[PDB]
Structure formats: C-alpha cells, structure tokens
Amino acid sequence: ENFTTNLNQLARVGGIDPLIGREKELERAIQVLCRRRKNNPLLVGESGVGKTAIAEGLAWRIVQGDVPEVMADCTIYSLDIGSLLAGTKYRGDFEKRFKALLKQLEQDTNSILFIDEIHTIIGAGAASGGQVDAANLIKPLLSSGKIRVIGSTTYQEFSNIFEKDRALARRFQKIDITEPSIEETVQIINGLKPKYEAHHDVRYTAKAVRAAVELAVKYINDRHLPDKAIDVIDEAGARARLMPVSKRKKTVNVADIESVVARIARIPEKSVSQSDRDTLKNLGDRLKMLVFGQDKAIEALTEAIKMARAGLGHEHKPVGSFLFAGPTGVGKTEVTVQLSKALGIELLRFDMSEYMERHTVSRLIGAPPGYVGFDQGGLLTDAVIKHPHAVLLLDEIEKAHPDVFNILLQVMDNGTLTDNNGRKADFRNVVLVMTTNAGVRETERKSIGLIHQDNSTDAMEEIKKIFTPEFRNRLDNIIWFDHLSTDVIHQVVDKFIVELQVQLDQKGVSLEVSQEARNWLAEKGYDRAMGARPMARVIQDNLKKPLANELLFGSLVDGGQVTVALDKEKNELTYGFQS
Amino acid sequence: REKELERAIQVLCRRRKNNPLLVGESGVGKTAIAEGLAWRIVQGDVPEVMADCTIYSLDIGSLLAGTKYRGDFEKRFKALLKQLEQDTNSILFIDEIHTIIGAGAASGGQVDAANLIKPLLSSGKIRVIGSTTYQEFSNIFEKDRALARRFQKIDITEPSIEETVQIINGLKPKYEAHHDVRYTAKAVR
C-alpha cells in the first residue's frame, strides 16, 4: 500500500493542478471505465503532452463529485514502479510484492491503478536485461475485471509491444492524445497562472504568455508544446526574482522571456527575438558589412523574402525558393552561411553528387541503412524534422536524376513529404536555396574547330534547356553574378590577412605585407573559371611554409616583427624576422 | 620490476588513495610483485618507512570454511580488521579482490566483505593491495564505484624479452636444484 500513492486522497490536501481542456478525452475515460469488459483505458501520447495530468484530473473530478454516481465512490492509485524495482535484488521479489498489493486492492472494489509508463514493465526490456516478466501479473487483472488499470504509453511503444500482443491490446482501449493547439495552450497557462504568481508574488502579463508558447515551438523542436512551455514560465519566475538582486521587478515583459529561452536554446538573444518587422529591415543591412561584394544580390534576395514573410502569403509554399545561377565558388554560398548565422539556424549542406544514383535517391526519402531499426528515418525527412526552420543548401543540383526533381515539386506545392517511415514533416517555415554550376563547365569546355570561339554565355540560358519550364514557373526569383570586382579580390587578401593576423595575435607575432605584393598574390590565386575556390589555399601557402620552420625556435617566438615584400626580378616574397 | 615496485610503495605512502590496485593480465607477475614486496622488505632493499611493515595475505576459502552460523563471517572479518588498524603498519594483500564483492552474504543479511571494509578505507587507517584482470575489473570491480574510488589503478604489462631472460637467470637456481640440472644461458634465450 505504501508503494502506490492515493491520488484521490492527495486532491483533498491539495497538490492537484486544475485541468484546462481535454474534456473529450476525460469523457472517453469515464465512458470506457464504466464498461463491463475491456474497460481498462490507455493513454497513447508522446512525452510532455500531459497524459499523466488527465489521470490526476479524474481524481479531482471524483472528489469534487462532478462524475457519475457509480464512479463517485471510486478511488485511484498511482503505482510507483521505481520503488518496488529499486528494493529488489533479483527477479521474483518484485512479482511477490506486486502480488501482495494487487490482492489488497482487489479486496476493496472501485480501485483504479494508474500505471504510468506501463510499457516499461509490460515489455521491450533493455533496462537491466529486461523486466518483461512483470506482464505476467498484469494479464490476470485485465481478464479478471475486478480492478481497472489506467495505462500511459506512446505511439512507438504501443505498436511495438501492445498491438503485437493481443492479450493486452484486446483488454485495453485507446484514447489518442494530441498536442493542444496554440490557442488551447495559452488558456492552459492562464489556468495555472494563479499558482505561480502566489508562489513568489509576481504578475504575468498576457503578452508574455503568448510570446512564451510561440517562441518555444519555433525554437525548441526537441520537446512538446505543453510541458516545455511551463518550464519557460517557471524559469522566468525564478530568473526574474534571483538575477536582479538590486531591483525587484514583479512586472514581466516579452523581452525578459527571450533571455529565458536563450539559455536552453543556446542561441544569441537578438536572433531569438520574434520581431519580423525589425529583423526584415536589418537583415539586408546586416549582410552588407558582414559580406562585401555582389551587394546587388543581397538587395533582391532580401526584398523577395519580405514578400513571403509578410504573413499575407499562404505559408503552404516554402518561405524561400531562390534558385541561384551563374558562377560558383563565389560569395553566394558564403551569404547563406552568414544568413544562417544571423538567424541562428543550422545550415544543412545537402550534396546531390552522393545521391546521383537512382537507388541512392531513396536515401533522402527512406531509411539509408534499409534495416529494421525503425528509427533511422530518411536523410531529407529526418533533417527537416530536426531543424524545421533551417535552410537546405542544395549542392551539385546538376548531377540529379529526374526523380530527385520530382520530390522537389511536392515540397514547393504540397509543403509536405511522405516516405517509407511515414513521419510527417513541416515545411511551412523551411527555406530552400540551390546552386547551378553548369555554366562554369561550359566556359572551360573546348570547341571542336580550327579556331576556338568565345562563348560568353549568360546564366539564364542554361536553366531554359537543362531545367523544365515547370520548375521556373514555381520558382520565385533567380539571381545572377559575373565577378565581384578587381579591387574586392585585393580586399579578399586583406580579409584573410585579418583572420591570419588574428592568428598571429594569439602567438604574439606581428607581420606586415607590401601593398603591391598583396595585389599580385590576389591575382595569382583568383581565377575566372575557378573563382575564389583556390584563393584560400594560396594565402596560407605563401607564408605558412617559411614561417613554420623558424616559429619553433626563432624571433617569431617573441614578438615576430616580420617583414614581407616581393622581389621585382624574382616575384617571390622575402621573409625577415626582427623579434 | 623495479619501476612497478616504486609505484606501489608511492601509492602506499600517500595520504589518500593509500590502497594500490595491480591491474594486469594472467601470468604477467602481478602476484609475484606483492609476494616479492615482502621478500624485498626482509632483505632490506626498500625505504626505511616500508622496512617495518608486515604484509598479510587473506585466504577467502578458509574464511568461509566454518561460517555456518549467523554472524560468523562478520565477526571473523571484523576481528581481522581490528588487528590491521591497531598496528597501523600492516598491509593486507588480497588477490582476486573482485571475489569478495559478493562473498560472505548468502541471503537476507547481504553483509558482503566489500561493504564491511568500505568504511575503514574512507578514513585511510588500513591500506591493502589488490589484484585483478582488465576484464574482471571492468565487469565487476568497476561496478562498485565506492571501492574503485579508494583504490588507485596500476597498469601492468608483460616485460620485454630482454627483461625476461634476466628473470629466468635469477630464478634458474631454484629450478636447477629441484630438477638436478644446469640450464645454459643460450638455452634460456
């Protein structure tokens, strides 16, 4: 008796939170509990949805008396699985103790056993060699009918052990529990608001509660809406009182909540703020100082984003579908990195080269191992599930089979994807970006003729033929690039030198390079066909090779005072160290 | 085994983690080190601090031979522990320390030797030497985090072929007398 706690008795002394919503689920439980056979209900719900809370709600309803007369005198108990198991040394002790309780319970009629996480004891093991033997004592109770046992499980566990074993599923009904809508969630917090304000004497504004639920779902993708929401409010109450020791401010604002979610989110506070107005205007300017050159693309890209993120547009269509074209190995890819960094989203670099083969296309829309793991998920499907609000950086789109393109059509129009696993992903907030490298290949392609003929092709021409016009119809906008500038390439040497010089600062080394040498080195590394792809390698090669030999023992160890300048006759940089 | 010996003496002398643990493989010579440590002490080729020490070795089979009645194992083991703390200079070299983890308690009482010795080790009044294999240490000894915290693991490895020939020459007289034969230096190599 001491193992299991009497929830109904607890309600009299308090500690039972009021139940907001889920009345239909509660009625189903009352309806099924009144059955002669198969009355035992089951709560198939995901973690954090509040399935355990409705069980306590039944105890509150009974003591209150707003239930049928037959159940008015009924009692509910919450089996403490951890208590019995912890005390045991070897199997057989738990079964004996459980048998004693069940007999004591059967003596008194109208006794309900709420076995939270029933799947743990019923089967699937993998805890301490498995505790599947506990199912033995559960089947008689179901068949006997003397007592009604409420169960809490999950969709994954239910199908794995319950649906397979008819003995349990036949004597167990199903009450599907689904996460409540955003509208229902704020109402739930309002019902629980009195407890928190009376706890430490602070008021909660309606603005903050609405902000808490929307921010958590947008950022916290690893927890459900009802449970994680309470933590945000509870964390805010603690943080609000404890942090400002000097000033005790009871009033809370939406900005205060942003800092609370920042800690668990581990993302900058400014990015965490849900300010579409402020972010849209500054996003364009933010991309200018961070990334210099080809600024025209930032202007067109940003204004197009404003049209879709305005809110009027139906979000069934992906937020962004910009299909970049023209030269590659340019700041186009860099822009996405900084765009993902400013927002804080995780950039996913999906390369089609690996998925060129037709069979490999299934990896995106199917479990890659093709095993019975039943938890791997598709590469594209699970990646969107992990980060529903993150951009997908499509790479090497040219080496893609037609079936690969077919999958893209679904997300652009349907906004949902179905795979072998069967898990549904949300593409409302996802962004999509592509890159076309076909143009670069044609530029270096030789011509079969006596004299080579110049081919100054344009980015537009390739997509007309290689890609079906159907894709262009759905496409929102296409950007083009030619080259950044002659001067910017010289500046690219300076930008790399800034990070390279920052490296020297750690070593307490100082180095200077000639302005003329910087220009020539930039030209040597930069190429029209290859763009800036090889520029990174040449920068390090110029100085890393000579400096490495003397850094171990030499003047570089203390101050450096290095001098770098080219030779006119040899066009080779010279290194001199003055400590 | 001069280096391995140093580590044990150092572990015994330090304030905390006084109990060393000679982890190794079967046949490496971990038991000989403990048995050889006492031989070194009587010979006198050890520091003055350890010269006065007296190493003891516990046989679990004899301890469990007559523990038929209730409290027999507890009184015996507890009695022996009292002797160690009063002297303050003795060391109980118990081989196969993993065995005592579940020994001494048939059922109900669950008074295992590991639990009984644990408190005394916390203070550090008694120092002991253990021996276990890698597989046994991880599978059984590592489970008992309390005991592992008190003991300081020592990694032992088979000696080099050069060291082995010296060992054979040192031990050659013992086997030469028993078998009444003379082993050549070329044969041992």
């Binding site: 070897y90 | 209730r70 048939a106």
Partner: peptide
Amino acid sequence: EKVRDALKPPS
C-alpha cells in the same frame, strides 16, 4: 533465475 541460497541456522 535459478539461484541456490545457503541458509544460516541461529546459534
């Protein structure tokens, strides 16, 4: 499982 237990009689 199937484990053997050794009893202890009272002195």
